[PDB]
């Protein structure tokens, strides 16, 4: 009963930011999925294009791991279908979807005195993103008719803004962690199935 | 690509980045008012310095763009609040200048010391003075007390106050205003939708009309205080004549809360109080905060967030840490929102538990709107929500039901009566005097009344309007306004005015749809979930609408009347009108103390 470490991405020491997110592949592997539900972290769950039970009696051949931090009230962002600075600039999901998001309150673990500044997200881009695009280039944004030969400055704003996570902010600024789960089916013989 | 769509993404660079400096300089003013030491004060001007230049290089930036070519409606307010800097757009030399001034202006209010006649102490104004003026009953000693004042603080603050009115007229000039006083009237301007709009001259013309429904009120109320000063004082008041300034119970007369003891109705009925039944059952500092919980809890109002019940100051602490105890209600930002208040077991602290957080409860109403409109209405919105729930606290309604008091209290009007007195001082008390000083200050900044002719007129509007007069003659030499925390500083007087009759608006529309019949005296708004609904959608406005539609919203009127006013002090209209029909009701200017 070989079983992939579901636990390396759920208790990864590290996660990572928002406009450089991270992708895991999952493959030949049986999916337990009782230690998510029994896990005394996770508070959120929702499921869009399978049933949360019988997960594991209907099983596909790749499974895709996700994972960033956002805030609070930026968690409902996280939906096909959605609109929003997520969504439209750093991570768009797409309007047909089969998967899973999962996503509990980490104020413990990611915030401290003096702010957090190693999370950070896109802010300006020209066009919105196609579902499952990740943009990691930093190029300074025009807003004006006029370049400013790529130095920042009048009418030229920096792309990326920074998240201060610190331990007294409200709960809806709170880092929360997320991660979602992308099954996916193509013509292999079932690798993953489950137990 | 064109000037609204750019502008449209420079406030988003300005949003995102405004709130995370305005958390560090509240936390850190935050942190001086909980724990007094010299580090920390050192962390505020830092902290300060940097929100304060962040502030200039933003505001500078944002005149470059052009007002016409901005279309939408939300967007034209936001840009024009920033756009607004006023003294920057002089030379420094001047502004130099003015902030020396203003400066100094605090210096001789802060270092008050007026000379005893007996060596062992000079008195200075905190809080040997105050006590003089409010535990005092010999005419000759409050007398020389409130001259020592002007005495000593007017000589020196009228030859610096020819240059402030001057200085300040320039800064105007530049933003074509008329004047000074436009400025300060210039907060309650909207000039856009034909319906809702105001103006700045409108302001005018209506404190005055509102204000003359209020003299029937305040004459009648102005003669009984006569009668009762006459027992103490038999040969110093004329039947028919003005009481003395020194004599309203405070250095000012701003309120005349410290004549209940002598003027009360009913000396034999006991007022109400529940503090010696608050020691029974051992009420603890964390209960009335929890109990004033269930009254926003019961109008279906949110509950209190998670960071509100710790790392908040709740009590005194027992650590020795130097702090200052006024009471305040802060809203740091970022979902934090915390209060910080000197509990004890009092009725007081009782009444002001609820006034504080109705603060908080408004503070988290409008976190969905922007930074730049997290805002009352305007200035007189923001007190004025707190003050009605102080009102329901204190009906016998509210405490029946907590078992505070006998669950078979008996009702009696003497003793309502008892209670109405004693707040027609304060809330009534104050109307005349906040009118009177606001309209001198307008007339000066426009230049009607001449230098020369400064303390003549002072005192004639007071004869006429106020009813009092000076004890002792006055020249020009002397400078009373200067005498007054908001006059010496950069401050408007004109929020306590109007907060006052909106306070009395809200409070008569929420009892209506809380289906209480009868007299607006006990009308409680606890386990009405109706009238919640009705606030909420006023709170949650913000800044982003115009006052009038907010009013309009709770209301259903565009405009700021005195009726709900006069109807809450009905009841003690009737009895107080039998009672001075025995003497003259009004005064005479032409009487004269010193002659
Ligand atoms: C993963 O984190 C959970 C949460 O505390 C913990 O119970 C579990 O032991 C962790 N797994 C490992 C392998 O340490
Ligand atoms: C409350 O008052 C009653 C009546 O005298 C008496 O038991 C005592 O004074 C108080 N009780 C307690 C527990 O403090
Ligand atoms: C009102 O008070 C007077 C005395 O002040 C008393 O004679 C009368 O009965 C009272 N009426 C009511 C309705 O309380
Ligand atoms: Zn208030």
């Known amino acids: ?195 | 690509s064109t000037t609204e769509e750019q502008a449209k993404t420079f406030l988003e660079k300005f949003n995102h980045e405004a709130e995370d400096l305005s958390y560090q300089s509240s936390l850190a003013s935050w942190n001086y008012n909980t724990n007094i030491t010299d580090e920390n004060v050192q962390k505020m001007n830092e902290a300060r310095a940097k929100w304060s230049a962040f502030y200039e290089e933003q505001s500078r930036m944002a005149k470059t763009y052009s007002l016409e070519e901005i279309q939408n409606l939300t967007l034209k307010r936001q840009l024009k609040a920033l756009q607004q800097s006023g003294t920057s757009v002089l030379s420094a030399e001047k502004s130099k200048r003015l902030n020396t001034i203003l400066n100094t202006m605090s210096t001789i209010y802060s270092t008050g010391k007026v000379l005893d006649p007996n060596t062992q102490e000079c008195l200075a104004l905190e809080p040997g003075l105050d006590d003089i003026m409010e535990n005092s009953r010999d005419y000759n000693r409050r007398l020389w007390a409130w001259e020592g004042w002007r005495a000593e603080v007017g000589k020196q603050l009228r030859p610096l106050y020819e240059e402030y009115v001057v200085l300040e007229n320039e800064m105007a000039r530049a933003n074509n205003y008329e004047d000074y006083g436009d400025y300060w009237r210039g907060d309650y301007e909207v000039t856009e939708a034909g319906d809702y709009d105001y103006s700045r001259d409108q302001l005018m013309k209506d404190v005055e009309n509102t204000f003359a429904e209020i003299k029937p009120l305040y004459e009648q109320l102005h003669a009984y205080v006569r009668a009762k000063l006459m027992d103490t004082y038999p040969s110093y008041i004329s039947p028919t004549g003005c009481l003395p300034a020194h004599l309203l119970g405070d250095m000012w007369g701003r309120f005349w809360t410290n004549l209940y003891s002598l003027t009360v109705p009913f000396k034999h009925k006991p007022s109400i109080d529940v503090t010696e039944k608050m020691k029974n059952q051992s009420w603890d500092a964390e209960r009335i905060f929890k109990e004033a919980e269930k009254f926003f809890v019961s109008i279906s109002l949110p509950h209190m967030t998670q960071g509100f019940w710790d790392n908040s100051m709740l009590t005194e602490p027992g650590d020795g840490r130097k702090v200052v105890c006024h009471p305040t209600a802060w809203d740091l930002g970022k979902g934090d929102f915390r209060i910080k208040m000197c509990t004890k077991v009092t009725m007081d602290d009782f009444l002001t538990a609820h006034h504080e957080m109705g603060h908080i409860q408004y503070d988290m109403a409008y976190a969905a709107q922007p930074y730049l409109l997290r805002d009352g209405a305007n200035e007189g919105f923001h007190e004025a929500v707190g003050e009605i729930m102080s009102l329901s606290a204190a009906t016998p309604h509210y405490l029946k039901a907590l078992g505070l008091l006998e669950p078979d209290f008996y009702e009696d009007n003497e003793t309502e009566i008892n209670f109405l007195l004693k707040q027609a001082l304060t809330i009534v008390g104050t109307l005349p005097f906040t009118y009177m000083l606001e309209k001198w200050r307008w007339m000066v900044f426009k230049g009607e009344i001449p230098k020369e002719q400064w303390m003549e007129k002072w005192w004639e509007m007071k004869r006429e309007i106020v009813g009092v007069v000076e004890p002792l003659p006055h020249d020009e030499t002397y400078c009373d306004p200067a005498c007054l925390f908001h006059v010496a500083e950069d401050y408007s007087f004109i929020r306590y005015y109007t907060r006052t009759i909106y306070q009395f608006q809200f409070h008569e529309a929420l009892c209506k749809t809380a289906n209480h019949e009868g007299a607006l005296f006990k009308c409680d708004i606890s386990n009405s979930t109706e009238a919640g609904q009705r606030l909420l959608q006023m709170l949650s406005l913000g800044k982003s609408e115009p006052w009038t539609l907010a009013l309009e919203s709770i209301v259903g009127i565009k405009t700021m009347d005195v009726k709900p006013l006069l109807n809450y002090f009905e009841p003690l209209f009737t009895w107080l009108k039998e009672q001075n029909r025995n003497s003259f009701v009004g005064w005479s200017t032409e009487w004269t103390p010193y002659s």
């Open chain 1, 1 to 195: 009963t070989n079983l992939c470490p579901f636990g390396e991405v759920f208790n990864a020491t590290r996660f990572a930011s928002v406009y450089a997110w991270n992708r895991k592949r999952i493959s030949n592997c049986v999916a337990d999925y009782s230690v998510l539900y029994n896990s005394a972290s996770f508070s959120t769950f929702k499921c869009y294009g399978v049933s949360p039970t019988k997960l594991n009696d209907l099983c596909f051949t790749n499974v895709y791991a996700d994972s960033f931090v956002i805030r609070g009230d930026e968690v409902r962002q996280i939906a096909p279908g959605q609109t929003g600075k997520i969504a439209d600039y750093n991570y768009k999901l797409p309007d047909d979807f089969t998967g899973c998001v999962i996503a509990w309150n980490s104020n413990n673990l990611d915030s401290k005195v003096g702010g957090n500044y190693n999370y950070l997200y896109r802010l300006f881009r020209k066009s919105n993103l196609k579902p499952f695009e990740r943009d990691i280039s930093t190029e300074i944004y025009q807003a004006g008719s006029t370049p400013c030969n790529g130095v920042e400055g009048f009418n030229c704003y920096f792309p990326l803004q920074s998240y201060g996570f610190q331990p007294t902010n409200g709960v809806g600024y709170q880092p929360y962690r997320v991660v979602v789960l992308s099954f996916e089916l193509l013509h292999a013989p079932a690798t993953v199935c489950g137990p």
